[PDB]
Swiss-Prot record, chains A, B:
Residues of the full protein shown: 30 to 68 of 2188
Self-association and partners: Interacts with capsid protein VP1 and capsid protein VP3.
Localisation: Virion
Function: Lies on the inner surface of the capsid shell. After binding to the host receptor, the capsid undergoes conformational changes. Capsid protein VP4 is released, Capsid protein VP1 N-terminus is externalized, and together, they shape a pore in the host membrane through which the viral genome is translocated into the host cell cytoplasm.
Name by which UniProt lists this protein: Capsid protein VP4
Organism: Human enterovirus D68
PTM notes: Myristoylation is required during RNA encapsidation and formation of the mature virus particle.
Amino acid sequence: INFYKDSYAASASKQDFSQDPSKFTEPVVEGLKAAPVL
Amino acid sequence: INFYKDSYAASASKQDFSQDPSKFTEPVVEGLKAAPVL
Amino acid sequence: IESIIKTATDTVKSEINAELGVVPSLNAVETGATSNTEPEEAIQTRTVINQHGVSETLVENFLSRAALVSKRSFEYKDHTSSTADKNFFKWTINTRSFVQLRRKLELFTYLRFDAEITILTTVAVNGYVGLPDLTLQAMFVPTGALTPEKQDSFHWQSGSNASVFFKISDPPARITIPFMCINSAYSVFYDGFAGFEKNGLYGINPADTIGNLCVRIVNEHQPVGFTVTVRVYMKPKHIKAWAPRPPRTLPYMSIANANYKGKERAPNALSAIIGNRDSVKTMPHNIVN
Amino acid sequence: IESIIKTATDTVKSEINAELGVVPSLNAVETGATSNTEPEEAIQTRTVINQHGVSETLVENFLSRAALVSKRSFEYKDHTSSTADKNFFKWTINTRSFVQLRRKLELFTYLRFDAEITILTTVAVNGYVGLPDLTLQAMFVPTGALTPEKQDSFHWQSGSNASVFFKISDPPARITIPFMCINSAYSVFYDGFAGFEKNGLYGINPADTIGNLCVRIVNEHQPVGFTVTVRVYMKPKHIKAWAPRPPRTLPYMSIANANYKGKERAPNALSAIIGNRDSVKTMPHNIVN
Amino acid sequence: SDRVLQLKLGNSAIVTQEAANYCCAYGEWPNYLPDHEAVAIDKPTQPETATDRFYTLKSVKWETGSTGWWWKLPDALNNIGMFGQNVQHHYLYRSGFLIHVQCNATKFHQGALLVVAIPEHQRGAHNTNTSPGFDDIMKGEEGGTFNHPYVLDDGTSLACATIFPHQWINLRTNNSATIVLPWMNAAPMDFPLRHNQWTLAIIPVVPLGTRTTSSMVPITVSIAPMCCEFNGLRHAIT
Amino acid sequence: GVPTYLLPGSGQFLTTDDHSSAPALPCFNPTPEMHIPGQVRNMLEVVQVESMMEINNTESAVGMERLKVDISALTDVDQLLFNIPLDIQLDGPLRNTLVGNISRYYTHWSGSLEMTFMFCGSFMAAGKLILCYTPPGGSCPTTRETAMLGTHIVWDFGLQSSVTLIIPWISGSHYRMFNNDAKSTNANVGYVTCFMQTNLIVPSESSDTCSLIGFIAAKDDFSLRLMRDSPDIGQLDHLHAAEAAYQ
Amino acid sequence: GVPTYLLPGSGQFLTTDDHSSAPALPCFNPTPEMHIPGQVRNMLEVVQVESMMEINNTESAVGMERLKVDISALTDVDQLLFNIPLDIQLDGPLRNTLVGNISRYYTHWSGSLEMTFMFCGSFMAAGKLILCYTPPGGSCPTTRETAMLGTHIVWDFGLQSSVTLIIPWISGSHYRMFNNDAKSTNANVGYVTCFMQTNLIVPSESSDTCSLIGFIAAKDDFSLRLMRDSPDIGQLDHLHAAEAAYQ
Amino acid sequence: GVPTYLLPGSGQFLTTDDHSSAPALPCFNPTPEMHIPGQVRNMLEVVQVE
Amino acid sequence: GTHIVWDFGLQSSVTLIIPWISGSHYRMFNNDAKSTNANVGYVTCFMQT
Ligand SMILES: COCCn1cc(-c2ccnc3c(NCc4ccc(OC(C)C)cc4)cccc23)cn1
Ligand SMILES: COCCn1cc(-c2ccnc3c(NCc4ccc(OC(C)C)cc4)cccc23)cn1
């Protein structure tokens, strides 16, 4: 329920389930094998 | 009337009329006759 | 076999029997089955079309009634000299302190439910000036979070704890708490020990720990003292229930255990649950004319 | 690669390995990548279908909880002889004064959010007569607008400032403030100086300046003094967050900087964050039976 | 017909010629944990016939003053055979049980035993505020005796105990009772040394009596774990 | 805005109300459901399970002795053995039963009852009993040729250990009340009486005295109405350690 | 108008509520969004990043010295090198870690952990270690032939510097608790122990003593539940210059 | 939320008002209806009797 | 070990199978009864009740 004119008034947005942890866990230029890694 | 985002907020669910009393009244492996029962 | 039952069963008319080899009134209790004798088999019956509903004994309806779970009174005053709940209290959340709710819940072995919480506040002047319209804060402190130590400690800033602020002049404060067990159901009874050593608590499943309820008055103290009483009501809802149990017969002794003593004499004595009659042939309320 | 994750991952059953040239438990930490060893590669596993949701660690849910940002008490009285907040106060808006909210926000480098503000008011009689149902005015004074100098100054006429008027007997006053940075995100940390000369403030991005909150009692003073406490709560919402950070370990010293001292001894001492054990071979809570 | 029964599990078999059907608790049968209910991600060991076999406990004497007897599961089996060894080396266990209770007498004897499997039989103490201690609860293979069978030692009642899975041995009618127990827990698996899912209770609601020459009338309990699984292999607690 | 007005009952706390209310923990995910044996969905499933009657509620019956009735060989014909008070509201053999305990959370009831008796003598013991239900209106019958005029079953002891007497729902009203006035026409059910039809006959090496266990359950025509606080439980004080939850 | 009534909970301030509220600045246009590196959307992405364990949490380890474990050549076989307490709630090597710090805002947890060890001796240093996880129930093993019975990896030092021990989620319940009672069956995870499998062997011109750095992260089967105030931070007083915001 | 304002007559108890109100006994099943002789539906039926 | 629990009843008789449990295809009828090529193990009877 949102009868206010400005959209920033709305209730919280708990629906964004997109993740990309590899930008923190694997920021290497060459992706690693699941051969030895070096 | 439920305008809350979480479904556990809803009012009570008084609509489940399924019963199976035989799981307490007749938990025998062989169902009994309506011959003598032993 | 599962079926949908909205009303009590109809009765069919029945005739005289006299069939050899058929004995529907004989049973074998040793099997553990309950008697399957129908009324039509025991007597000659008429036809009755039965319209009585069964909705009031639904487990949802039986349990989803708001009941008192906690009641605390404390002095709202300047506490500088007191030794006491100093404008706030902490409560370790449990369902075992008030026997009417406890006995109904203990009809089952496992329960899954969300908890509707209603918080009712009342105030009286200490031994009159009128009653103040105070603001209260209730804060839920989960396991391993720190409880407040003072009325004004920084724990009350509630950065991640859920708090509700409510006035005395408001309608009672209300919130729902989800089913929060780490298992799929609460263990209403627990034949086990809470810890990996031998000295842990018997009878309390660690999986069922809710946490602490912390309630303060937010106003600074007035020049005069008041007594404030907080009552907490729980209503289970969205209920599933498993494995029905023998009801409690002896008075409860403790919130911590099932210990029992009985009443000093029947009814509900340890030696005699039902009150005595003079003999097995005595009819106690026999009609005589 | 971005993907939509609603639940924790399933485990597949695994067999015995013994493959030459394949060493999934060996890794190279020097690359800066985290270990990619899967459980199925380290041990023989069963199949588990995993139904645990991940919604409670969403950044929106983690941060969008209302937390105390400001708390001010002032005397509501005739102030003609006082030297003091004379029925009003001014607050320079910041997120750094209460550590529980501060530490959660400081897990990130950049944040974009709208701020839901709840204003809770409480009153006590000075050392009793009953509590007055006062009207308050909160006025937002942006950068370069003039702040009020008195309880009754003409700045309170609020021709273009946003004001909210609220009673003590009301529910807490609530408003939303939009994301108002002159950049696309707030700088939670700022490795820079605010001015073009060398003497400007280190560590505060000028781009993030919100302004001042001015709160007065609107009633004229009564014949008796009261203490009024105003509590302001902020809830971030519609949150985007960038570049996660090492959490704060040492106690905060100042709202103005990251300065640190540590506790006098572990835990959270400057020389020892974790409390000591007797040796690297000592198990502190070892089960013994 | 259904007075004779044979039970075969592993290398063990039991025959009775005087059964009274048998009970499947709540109409369930034991099963292994399916993938859509599993929690622990390691591959379970499933020893099958090494564990899923009848173990016979020490017999108890039925005497005119007896209050009745109880055993807790898995506690009573945690030190027996390969079931005990798997229990001692694994953090987590799960199983059903097959319970077979044996008591025979002459056609001149009378007496009735209630044989009831109680889930989560959390015991109370009598006439004290102090909760039962570890040695009051964890009796192992020997089991315990009821203090106040009339209230099931839990302040409830014997009279309503028929709400639980049960049979009777009525000496006139039958000489054995059989109850099949599914896994009965709020979690899918449990630590076997700190929680008991089931208590077997045997209570003499009608006392043993006769006017023949007296003999020792024993009650014997045989229990087969069913569909045993173990997770979290480590050194034996033992 | 919407023009509105408040009704009577605004702001009340009714303990049986049914509304949605604010979730205190947003985005909380409850533990996945798991199948558990023995789900109950209606309390009527519980009262259909038979449970022992405390028929021997006499002084000099202690504990378990109260759940059985002892029968002996008699030397006079047609003798009365026992009677069962049928008032579920007043304290008696039916109160501490599954049907009894659940029904006492309700005020109104309807439908038939079954009593089952198990004979627990020796195999060599023989006998016939008559079990009679008398509809209400008069005194409980004390002689067999009076009790015989009501609803009854004649029970022969044999290989089948147990007999059922149905107590049929015979009532002018749709419901009866659990009324403390047991003589009220809205409450009184009548009586169950047991007589010798023949005799208990046993050889010398059997025990001369044999026991019955009585059981009661509701049939599936049974209904309960108007929920109330059960008078079975109460507290006069705080329980032990209830104060310690505040410390 | 519409007839209405107020429910319990009317007018309350619940800090986790979720409603729209009045915009104080009408027609305000927020700054256009700009792409920024490193957006996080779930806190589970952070706990999957490995971070150093404070394994050497001993007196006479100061600061950075607490983040490494020193290994020396031994003259006895099979010797214990170190153990790691696995209780995340109680203070120990795991607390000040990314997985540790984020998890302490929650009460319930599930799923597997990975420990990675990096050997930082010289190139000429050789050795084999055994890393063991013991599921809970007994004492922490003090001998290699006991620890060897649990989950383990045997690590050979080589060109790949680092080894992972997976700690698999082995639990009876769906979740564990971050419980201050570390011996609770709902909380205790068991133990990690490190033994010599062979020995540390080095030539004369290498340093005779070599270090391990231990790291921990969660795997992607990991879940957190029931948000709470983290016990890691607190204040006893106003911060410096917090009063000056009112002046 | 919805912006609202209270009218005159808000909170009054008018004895002839006609609103729904909160059921105190949820899921109560009233006794089945039975035909009874002599139902009256309008009081004008009574005043037509001499 | 391998066992049967025998209840006396209308059927007079019970069978215990001794299953062929051996490492080798055959055993020997060896006068050295303790030889691993010969020893079969034991049958024992106990009271169950
Ligand atoms: C058969 O029963 C065994 C299982 N079992 C369930 C519960 C239970 C669960 C959740 N809650 C409870 C409560 N709720 C108090 C409350 C909590 C948080 C609040 O939050 C506000 C401060 C924002 C308010 C009030 C009071 C009493 C009991 C409970 C206890 N045992
Ligand atoms: C990680 O954080 C770094 C970025 N950051 C965001 C904020 C912030 C933004 C907007 N507002 C805030 C507020 N709001 C007080 C308020 C303002 C106007 C009001 O208007 C009424 C008088 C009509 C009412 C209350 C209190 C505290 C903080 C804020 C501060 N720093």
